[PDB]
Amino acid sequence: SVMEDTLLSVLFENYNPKVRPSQTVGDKVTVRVGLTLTSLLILNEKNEEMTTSVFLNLAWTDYRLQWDPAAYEGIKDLSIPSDDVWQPDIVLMNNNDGSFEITLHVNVLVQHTGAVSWHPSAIYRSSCTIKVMYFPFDWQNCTMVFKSYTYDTSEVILQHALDAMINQDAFTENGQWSIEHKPSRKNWRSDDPSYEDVTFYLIIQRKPLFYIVYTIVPCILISILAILVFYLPPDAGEKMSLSISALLALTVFLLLLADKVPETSLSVPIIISYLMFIMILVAFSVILSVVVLNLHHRSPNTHEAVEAIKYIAEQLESASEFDDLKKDWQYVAMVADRLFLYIFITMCSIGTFSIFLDASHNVPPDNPFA
Amino acid sequence: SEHETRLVANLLENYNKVIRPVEHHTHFVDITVGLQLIQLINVDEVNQIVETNVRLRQQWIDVRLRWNPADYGGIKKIRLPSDDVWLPDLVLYNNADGDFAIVHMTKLLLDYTGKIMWTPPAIFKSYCEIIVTHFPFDQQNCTMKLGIWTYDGTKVSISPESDRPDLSTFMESGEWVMKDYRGWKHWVYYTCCPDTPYLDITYHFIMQRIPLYFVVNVIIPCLLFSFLTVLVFYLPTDSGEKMTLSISVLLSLTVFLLVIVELIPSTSSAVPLIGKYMLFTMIFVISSIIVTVVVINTHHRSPSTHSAIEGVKYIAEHMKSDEESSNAAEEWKYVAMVIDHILLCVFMLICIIGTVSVFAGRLIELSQEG
Amino acid sequence: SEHETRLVANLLENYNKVIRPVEHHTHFVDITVGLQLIQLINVDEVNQIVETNVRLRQQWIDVRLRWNPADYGGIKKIRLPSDDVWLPDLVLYNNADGDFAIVHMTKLLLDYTGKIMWTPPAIFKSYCEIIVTHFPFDQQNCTMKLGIWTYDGTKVSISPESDRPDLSTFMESGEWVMKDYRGWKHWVYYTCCPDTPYLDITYHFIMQRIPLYFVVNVIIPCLLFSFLTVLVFYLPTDSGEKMTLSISVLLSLTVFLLVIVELIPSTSSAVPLIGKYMLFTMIFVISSIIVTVVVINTHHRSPSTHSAIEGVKYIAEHMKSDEESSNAAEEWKYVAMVIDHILLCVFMLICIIGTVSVFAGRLIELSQEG
Amino acid sequence: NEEGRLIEKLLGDYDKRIKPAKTLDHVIDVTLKLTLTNLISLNEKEEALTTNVWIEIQWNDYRLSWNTSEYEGIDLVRIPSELLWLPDVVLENNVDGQFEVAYYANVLVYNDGSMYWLPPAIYRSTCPIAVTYFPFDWQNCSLVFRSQTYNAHEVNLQLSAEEGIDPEDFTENGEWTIRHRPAKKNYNWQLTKDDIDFQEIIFFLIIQRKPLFYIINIIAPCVLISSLVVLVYFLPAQAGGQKCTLSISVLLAQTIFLFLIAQKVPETSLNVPLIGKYLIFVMFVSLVIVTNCVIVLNVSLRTPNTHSCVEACNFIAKSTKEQNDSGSENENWVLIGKVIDKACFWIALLLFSLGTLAIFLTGHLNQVPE
Amino acid sequence: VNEEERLINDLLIVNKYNKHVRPVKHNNEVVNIALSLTLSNLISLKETDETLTTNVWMDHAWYDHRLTWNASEYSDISILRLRPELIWIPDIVLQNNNDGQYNVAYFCNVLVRPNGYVTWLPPAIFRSSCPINVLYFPFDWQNCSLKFTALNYNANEISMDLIIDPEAFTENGEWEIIHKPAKKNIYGDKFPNGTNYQDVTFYLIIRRKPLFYVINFITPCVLISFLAALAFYLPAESGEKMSTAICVLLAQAVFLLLTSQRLPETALAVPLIGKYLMFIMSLVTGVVVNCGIVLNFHFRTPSTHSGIDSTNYIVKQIKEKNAYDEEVGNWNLVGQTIDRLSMFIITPVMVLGTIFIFVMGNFNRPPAK
Known part of the structure; x- marks a missing residue:
């Protein structure tokens, strides 16, 4: 009773819905912003698009809602729909690639002397620079800048919790990636009067090892038929034609591979590294098989009286066997041996190279997890 | 205090939001547009659709918003939310594919005098020419008109604000590149009606396309195929033993050319x-076609290639000799003298067609690169 | 005039729309519903989705709408805005994949008495069985039940009105054809609860599907592939000298149909x-494989066809006689006789299992055709 | 000039949902017209389209002719949507998607009570293009639209030219073309048996398409293909013995290519x-290509196999010569190529005929509808 | 008329009843709220990303003490309807599966009992991120865990107490539903210094894989x-x-x-x-x-892969000689x-x-x- 109807009344009589919990132009209302992440569902590492979900915990004080006996001293804590406070119509300078879901228009926790607690989980369409640099083992970092899209920091100050909180705090276990750390730094670019956005850093690490495995098999298994086509010459010289069949076959195979590679990066591309040199490794088996094909080509051919008849017989046979013996002199196997071992150098050299680069790529550019 | 409540309430009462600050029958409501694309998110030249960042600077005056010491004296310039304002139905003429995004419920600023600005952070859906003339090396100028949508120069008029480039905030992630962009004003009166119609801002986007990755993959299997067809020439004249062997390649390669066709027309699409x-590929690819068919039909062009005891000896020797003849006949079929002709015949052809393909390639690259 | 203001004012005050014209503890609200289907713009047999239009002919009564010379007298039948009506949340039980569209904001039929109807040109997306048994020749009857959503019998009741076909306005551009369409009513009380539950209209769509496009191309490559198989068998007789050739066409054949089954899975799913x-195609075609398995395995089934001066004349003709009986050996295996049994053996067996394929295929359509 | 009082006067009596109908037996005079401006999606297989239509809306309601303070002030007024009778437009046969931006827009009230309004609308529709619209003779797109609310005994729509156009702003990036746009104003009475006519708006659009790009992709390949097979056909006479199988390699290659085409453009027509x-011409000119093609192997399939002590021994050896000669003789009577050579000219003129039959007829199906 | 005009004026739902005020008899333990979960259908499964679109009947119950009516409300009809904006509705949040707001399980018609008890239960088309993990593939095919409850209120403003999953499991799914247990609970946590919001925990243990x-x-x-x-x-x-x-x-x-x-x-x-x-x-x-x-x-394999007498001896020489060649090959045959x-x-x-x-x-x- 104690002026309850009165209080109650006066409050709703004088209280202003559309007003800011501050008095004039000054230090403003110090709103607390801090989100406990739920998990993330889709990383479009290719366009640098980020759809995650977290809690929008906001909290500041409404010294305009401090109650009295019944709602203050009666029930120190009571729930009341928002819709009555300035809400950070927050957009993300890079990210905020789309609207809020479970972000605004939801109830809030209002304390006795005016404290306000609003904890809503939400899904948000963002876009961070995971750029086409989300695959190097050295990976990269990003700028996630949150802030309102009609308000300018003049009638409120924004403030954070931790900066180490981490993003693996609610990292998706469903992620083909991994994370090292999440930096959180408060910002106010001076290119705009409006103090604004906060930059949040993603020192992301995404190592999904699954198909590069059977990709290796081609390179090496194709090599099987490759070393084979380079081995088949002094193995079965008649490989002559069958050889060409091999490369038709070998080339179509690698071209189909050419088919799956562009359409697969089509959703998760970054530096060429792997492709850069396998591209070379490609060109390598490609041309090596084709010049060996020219190795194959280079051969212009390969690619008394009684006794007289006898004598005429003696000369017939012998005469042309030298001729076909000439073909021997012409297609001997010197090259095959020499370049099948130049094949030895080439393929085992260029092989242990990307082997190496790849080797160097996973270990060397790994520690910049920062 | 200072007529506190009397101040605020009076203002609400006699003021109709929907009213347009019409001032006598003349100048119309003078309202100016000024678009600053902060940045672009994505574009589809094929479907000529773009999602872009726009901060619309909208200006106009409402002499009804002028004040005295009890509104301007309170705090010079202040923040009043839109609603109460008459929003020009802005519209991109041959564009407009989408609603202005974040135009709604934003705020504006009123001066001690009245002058108001409405500059809400937009990003929207666009629709500009690209025609089949945009991806050229010689580009096309995206003609984009902007201006007042349902009001005439007698009720209202949209005017421009300034010059500024489109590559000022052009997307570096675009598969295209900018030349220049200009925008000049205009008033459109129609021979239809004797009346004076709306005003408009006309954008002109002059940019040339094609990211270079494409460039390399395609022209190299061509010089690739060039060498196999090059081999298609040299293989036969230096070795007609694997004519059919090449039969294979002719199959494996036009099919390679066939499947490359699926890939690049979808690129086309x-x-x-x-x-x-397209004609570049047309004759180029198709000569691979006309040349083969002749080269290989010609490759193919050849008939079959692609005392008494003493007498016994002479009836027998005579048998060996006319078959001797016969052997020479079929060889008199596959000569190695003109396969050399076709070699230089066409290689000059290829160095002609090729250098002719390089011709217009080089030529308008003498125009584009400029 | 004629109690002008007194008549429309009184009507608004003591009139309510949230309420339903409940009349004592009995038959519920007499709801008359029906399908008036005149267009089926889009449907997918695969996902069993149907976006069609049916004017929702509703018919029921509310005495409160009865009038005298001051509303009936005004103009017999008057049409009132639907708002005043309690609209049922009707919905497709195992369907309802989409909102009904165009029902809101419409006209309502009122009578001097009270009779009322409102046939809304409702268009919506549906969801009913088609299963894998949707498009056979023997059809399936999509069970489509419709009735009040969240209201039980104790408050509202609906009932059929008339029988009308589904083909009355069935799509002549449909990839299917109808046979019959029946709709009877019922009330569903459940063993769960002792209560008397909602009423509903159950439609059953009986119609056979499948254009003949997929059909023409399944069987063409089959007969054509049976031509090459037929060649498969005949060649060893007319050209066994191309058994290997046969091999090539099996790599050909095989890849082609292995690729044919690729199409199937895509198309089918x-x-x-x-x-x-598909079971038909399965074994029938594994039959060409099972048979080429045996037939070419059998085709390759064979070991390798897959004085003293007087003295040497004898060592010599000896040389010749040894080899001659020897060449007789390889021909001893390619007897050119079993080759004719294999094509006839299988020609009959393919003419028979083909006629078998032909059998259930036609039997099933001597069932469908019906 | 009573400016305030007048506004306040009518608004007193101002009636919303009531039509400006003098009385009830002669309806109001409603004017409408549409100028096409965007034909956004042509999915003819499903008979649907999306267009930005200028919905020119016009009617009469002197319920607000004004005095010196509003009519005379300015013979032009722009008053909000929700403030006068509004035709809820839709295309009977087409509009399958509620209008977008086609309503809720500023209308126009001159001074005598003339009302003008024209919102732009992107919406979906379903015009003809029913197993026809792909010819050279075109199916006239017939779209009739009217208010879907009331029926012509109270409402009456008007129109204008029924002779003059759809190509007024027919899109230049369409894979088609328009040649005429007729439009009639009419009453309501359809096949379905509806009475009380509500007039509508008929939209004829007989348009052309087929600007083939795929034509020569189809035309040069087939010639290359025909030649390829004619290679198969004449190449044999030129080709060596190792060519029978040579020819085969082509069949394999020829149809690998074939059904791949069969898979490529079939997709085309479904989307x-x-x-x-x-x-019909393609697949059957195609099946004939295939036919004489396999016929060829069956042709290069046909033929039986081409698919004193001194003297006693001199006697017998002179026999192996004549003996084997009888054998090589075999070859003769077997491979005297009457059928093959003639098979070249067989397909040749047959080629000319298949071609002439087809392109001559394509000449016709472009020339009758020309 | 039995005080009806007056009484619903007494309740005035929106005006007299505090709809923005939840009748929990003021600050105490809680309003006894109970949730009932019944899946009506499962339309899509994505094993790879642990996401599921499924329909649920959001059966909800709580006693609205200000809802109790009298004769011309209560007994006039011991059951009547009242929209969401005129009925207190729990803010049920799909705890780990509502990362996709609930549809038409929102502000819908509710059922008004006579003595305040109310009943709201409409249809929920929802999307969830259930415990797939890369362990939702071994034959056990894990156990999909989900919690439902009134998000906003705590243990002194709400108490929710507690059906098989295959009851409306979709038959067009590429999986198999083996079991579905249901048990409510309530729980505080470390950073919270008080207990709150009770919830419906429903584990779905399933299995899948084609035989095709x-x-x-x-x-x-x-x-x-x-x-x-x-x-x-x-x-x-x-x-x-x-x-x-x-x-x-x-x-x-x-x-x-x-x-x-x-x-x-x-x-x-x-x-x-x-x-x-x-x-x-x-x-x-x-x-x-x-x-x-x-x-x-x-x-x-490497390869398999006296004058007249003089002359013919030449041949017997060429004879034997290449017979060695001939055989050098079968040596390889193996x-x-x-x-x-x-x-x-x-x-x-x-x-x-x-x-x-x-x-x-x-x-x-x-x-x-």
């Missing part, structure tokens, strides 16, 4: 390139 | 059918 | 419309 | 394998089909490669385990290897090795082929354990 680009 | 069907 | 006539 | 991919996929293996199997039987019956035998490698090779290509395609659409994916590609490689083996083994090859092909096929379904079983036995 993925990105609108001026068809006159 | 892209357009629904009862698996029992 | 876009369809028609069988042009379809 | 097995069909057309192993099918080609025994068919293909017989080719490679015959491959070694064929080197005997006629190894002379050198080039043509070579053709088949190209051909059995191109077949092999894109077969594996279709594999990841469906793979990405499905998070496949490492245990199974290897047996597939391991064994096709087994043939791939032996195709390469086929290569060499098929082309592996034919008494033939059977052992195809015997030691049989043995291994048996070894590995068995090793797989041997392993098939050694893991087929323990789950059935």
Whole structure:
């Protein structure tokens, strides 16, 4: 009773819905912003698009809602729909690639002397620079800048919790990636009067090892038929034609591979590294098989009286066997041996190279997890 | 205090939001547009659709918003939310594919005098020419008109604000590149009606396309195929033993050319390139076609290639000799003298066609690169 | 005039729309519903989705709408805005995949008495069985039940009105054809609860599907592939000298149909059918494989066809006689006789299992055709 | 000039949902018209389209002719949507999607009570293009639209030219073309048996398409293909013995290519419309290509196999010569190529005929509808 | 009329009743709220990303003490309707599966009992991120956990107490629903200094995998394998089909490669385990290897891959001489090795082929354990 109807009344009589919990132009209302992440569902590492979900915990004080006996001293804590406070119509300078879901228009926790607690989980369409640099083992970092899209920091100050909180705090276990750390730094670019956005850093690490495995098999298994086509010459010289069949076959195979590679990066591309040199490794088996094909080509051919008849017989046979013996002199196997071992150098050299680069790529550019 | 409540309430009462600050029958409501694309998110030259960042600077005056010491004296310039304002139905003429995004419920600023600005952070859906003339090396100028939508120059007039580039905030992630962009004003009166119609801002986007990755993959299997067909020439004249062997290649390669066709027309369908680009491939690819068919039909062009005891000896020797003849006949079929002709016949052809393909390639690259 | 203001004012005060014209503890609200289907713009047999239009002919009564010379007298039948009506949350039980569209904001039929109807040109997306047994020749009857959503019998009741076909306005551009369409009513009380539950209209769509496009191309490559198989068998007789050639065409054949089955899975899962069907193709074609298995295995089935001066004349003709009986050996295996049994053996067996394929295929359509 | 009082006067009596109908037996005079401006999506196989229509709306309601303070002030007024009778437009046969931006827009009230309004609308529709619209003779797109609310005994729509156009702003990036746009104003009475006519708006659009790009992709390959097979056909006379199988390699290659085509463009017609006539020539000119093609191997399949002590021994050896000669003789009577050579000219003129039959007829199906 | 006008004026739902005020008899323990979960349908499953679109009947109950009516409300009709804005509605949040706001399970018509007890239960088209993990593929196919409850209120403003999942499991799913337990609870946490919001915890333990991919996929293996199997039987019956035998490698090779290509395609659409994916590609490689083996083994060997008297002696010389050549080749033939090859092909096929379904079983036995 104690002026309850009165209080109650006066409050709703004088209280202003559309007003800011501050008095004039000054230090403003110090709103607390801090989100406990739920998990993330889709990383479009290719366009640098980020759809995650977290809690929008906001909290500041409404010294305009401090109650009295019944709602203050009666029930120190009571729930009341928002819709009555300035809400950070927050957009993300890079990210905020789309609207809020479970972000605004939801109830809030209002304390006795005016404290306000609003904890809503939400899904948000963002876009961070995971750029086409989300695959190097050295990976990269990003700028996630949150802030309102009609308000300018003049009638409120924004403030954070931790900066180490981490993003693996609610990292998706469903992620083909991994994370090292999440930096959180408060910002106010001076290119705009409006103090604004906060930059949040993603020192992301995404190592999904699954198909590069059977990709290796081609390179090496194709090599099987490759070393084979380079081995088949002094193995079965008649490989002559069958050889060409091999490369038709070998080339179509690698071209189909050419088919799956562009359409697969089509959703998760970054530096060429792997492709850069396998591209070379490609060109390598490609041309090596084709010049060996020219190795194959280079051969212009390969690619008394009684006794007289006898004598005429003696000369017939012998005469042309030298001729076909000439073909021997012409297609001997010197090259095959020499370049099948130049094949030895080439393929085992260029092989242990990307082997190496790849080797160097996973270990060397790994520690910049920062 | 200072007429506190009397101040605020009076203002609400006699003021109709929907009213347009019409001032006598003349100048119309003078309202100016000023678009600053902060940045672009994505574009589809094929479907000529773009999602872009726009901060619309909208200006106009409402002499009804002028004040005295009890509104301007309170705090010079202040923040009043939109609603109460008459929002020009802005519209991109041949564009407009989408609603202005974040135009709604934003705020504006009123001066001690009245002058108001409405500059809400937009990003929207666009629709501009690309025609099959945008992907050219010689580009096309995206004609984009902007201006008042349902009001005439007698009720209202949209005017421009300034010059500024489109590559000022052009997307570096675009598969295209900018030349220049200009925008000049205009008033459109129609021979239809004797009346004076709306005003408009006309954008002109002059940019040339094609990211270079494409460039390399395609022309190299061509010089690739060039060498196999090059081999298609040299293989036969230096070795007609694997004519059919090459039969294989002819199959494996035009099919390679066939499947490359699925890939690049979808590219074609993925990105609108001026068809006159297509003829490059047309004759080029098709000569691979006319040349083969002749080269290999010719490759193919050849009939079959692609005392008494003493007398016994002479009836027998005579048998060996006319078959001797016969052998020479079929060889008199596959000569190695003109396969050399076709070699230089066409290689000059290829160095002609090729250098002719390089011709227009080089030529308008003498125009584009400029 | 005629109690002008007194008549419309009184009507608004003591009139309510939230309420339903409940009349004592009995038959519920007499709801008359029906389908008036005149267009089926889009449907997918695969996902069993149907976006059609049916004017929702509703018919029921509310005495409160009865009038005298001051509303009936005004103009017999008057049409009132639907708002005043309690609109049922009708919905497709195992369907309802989409909102009804165009029902809101419409006209309502009122009578001097009270009779009322409102046939809304409702268009919506539906969801009913088609399963893999949707498009056979023997059809399936999509069970479509419709009735009040969240209201039980104790408050509202609906009932059929008339029988009308589904083909009355069935799509002549449909990839299907109708046979019959029946709709009877019922009330569903459940063993769960002792209560008397909602009423509903159950439609059953009986119609056979499948254009003949997929059909023409399944069988063409079959007969054509049976031509090469037929060649498969005949060649060893007319050209066994190309058994290897045969091999090539089996790599050919095999890849082609292995690729044919690729199409199937895409198309089949892209357009629904009862698996029992592909079973036909399965063994029939594994039959060409099972048979080429044996036939070419059998085709390759064979070991390798897959004085003293007087003295040497004798060592010599000896040389010749040894080899001659020897060449007789390889021909001893390629007897050119079993080759004719294999094509006839299988020609009959393919003419028979083909006629077998032909059998259930036609039997099933001597069932469908019906 | 009573400016305030007048506004306040009518608003007193101002009636919303009531039509400006003098009385009830002669309806109001409603004017409408549409200027096409965007034909956004042509999915002819499903008979649907999306267009930005200028919905020119006009009617009369002197319920607000004004005095010196509003009519005379300015013979022009722009008053909000929700403030006068509004035609809820839709295309009977087409509009399958509620209008977008086609309503809720500023209307126009001159001074005598003339009302003008014109919102732009992107919406979906379903015009003809039913197993026809892909010819050279075109199916006239017939769209009739009217208010879907009331029926012509109270409402009456008007129109204008029924002779003059759809190509007024027919899109230049359409894979088609328009040649005439007729439009009639009419009453309501359809096949379905509806009475009380509500007039509508008929939209004829007989348009052309088929600007083939795929034509020569189809035309040069087939010639290359025909030649390839004619290679198969004449190349044998030129080709060596190792060519029978040579020819085969081509069949394999020839149809690998073939059904791949069969898979390529069939896709084409499913994503876009369809028609069988042009379809018939291809597959059957194609099946004949295949036919004489396999016929060829069956042709290069046909033929039986081409697919004193001194003297006693001199006697017998002179026999192996004549003996084997009888054998090589075999070859003779077997491979005297009457059938093959003639098979070249067989397909040749047959080629000319298949071609003439087809392109001559394509000449016709472009020349009758020309 | 029995005080009806007056009484609903007494309740005035919106005006007299505090709809923005939840009748929890003021600050105390809580309003006894109860949630009931019944899945009406499961339309889509995404095993790979642990996401599910499913329909639920959001059966809700709580007593509205200000809702109790009198004669012309209560007894006039011991049951009546009242919209959401005129009925207190729990703010049920799908705790770990509402990362996709609830549809038409929102502000819907509710059921008004006579003595305040109210009943609101409409349909919920929802999306969830259930505990798939890369362990939702072994045969147990995990247990999908979900919690439902009134999000906003705590343990002194709300108490929610507590149906099979296969009750409305979708029959067009590529999986199988084995069980679905239901038990409510309430729980505070470390950072919170007080207990609150009670919830409906419903675990769904399911299983899935086709008996169809097995069909057309192993099918080609025994068919293909017989080719490679015959491959070694064929080197005997006629190894002379050198080039043509070579053709088949190209051909059995191109077949092999894109077969594996279709594999990841469906793979990405499905998070496949490492245990199974290897047996597939391991064994096709087994043939791939032996195709390469086929290569060499098929082309592996170096070669197999007195005057008148004077004259004819010349021939007997040329005779014998190239007879040495002729034979230098059969030296290479290596034919008494033939059977052992195809015997030691049989043995291994048996070894590995068995090793797989041997392993098939050694893991087929323990789950059935």
